[PDB]
Amino acid sequence: EKKEKQIEQQKKIQMSNLMNQARLKVLRARDDLITDLLNEAKQRLSKVVKDTTRYQ
Amino acid sequence: SQGIQQLLQAEKRAAEKVSEARKRKNRRLKQAKEEAQAEIEQYRLQREKEFKAKE
């Protein structure tokens, strides 16, 4: 019964590590989406400063 | 009187036989710890197989 509780605890720990990594993949995706918005913004500003009117 | 002597001999053999039976059965009561172990090992083996299936 102690051996059974130990494997059940290991299963629950594995389920926890799986869920915790899953939420870090989701979070890291949110940041990567915003990061690529900021990448695209920085590129578009580098285009805008070629227009001598708005750049002035 | 041979009749009473023969009866007394049979009564003595009867008293001996019941007393020997008591001693034999008291020794059997002490054997319980020897006979128990094979059942204990089967329960251990059954719980081992159950645990490996649950794993």
Q: Scanning every residue of chain A, which has its alpha carbon at the shortest distance from the alpha carbon of B50?
A: A4
Asked whether A26 and A32 are in contact (CB, 8 A), the reply is: no
Q: Does B52 touch chain A (CB under 8 A)?
A: no
In chain A, which residues have their Cβ closer than 8 Å to the Cβ of B54? 4, 7
Nearest to B55 by CA among A4, A19, A40, A47: A4
Looking at the complex, report in whole angstroms how far the Cα of residue A2 sits from the nearest Cα belonging to chain B. Answer: 10
* Rounded distance between C-alpha atoms, residue A32 and residue A38, angstroms: 10
Number of neighbours of residue A4 by Cβ within 10 angstroms:
13
What is the residue type of B13?
A: R
Q: Does B55 touch chain A (CB under 8 A)?
A: yes
Opening angle at CA B14, ends B9 and B19, nearest 5? 125
Q: How was this structure determined?
A: cryo-EM
Question: Exposure pattern of B3-37 as b/e (b: 16+ CB <10 Å)?
Answer: eeeeeeeeeeeeeeeeeeeeeeeeeeeeeeeeeee
Final resolution, Å = 3.8
* Rounded distance between C-alpha atoms, residue A40 and residue A32, angstroms: 12
Residues composing chain B: 55
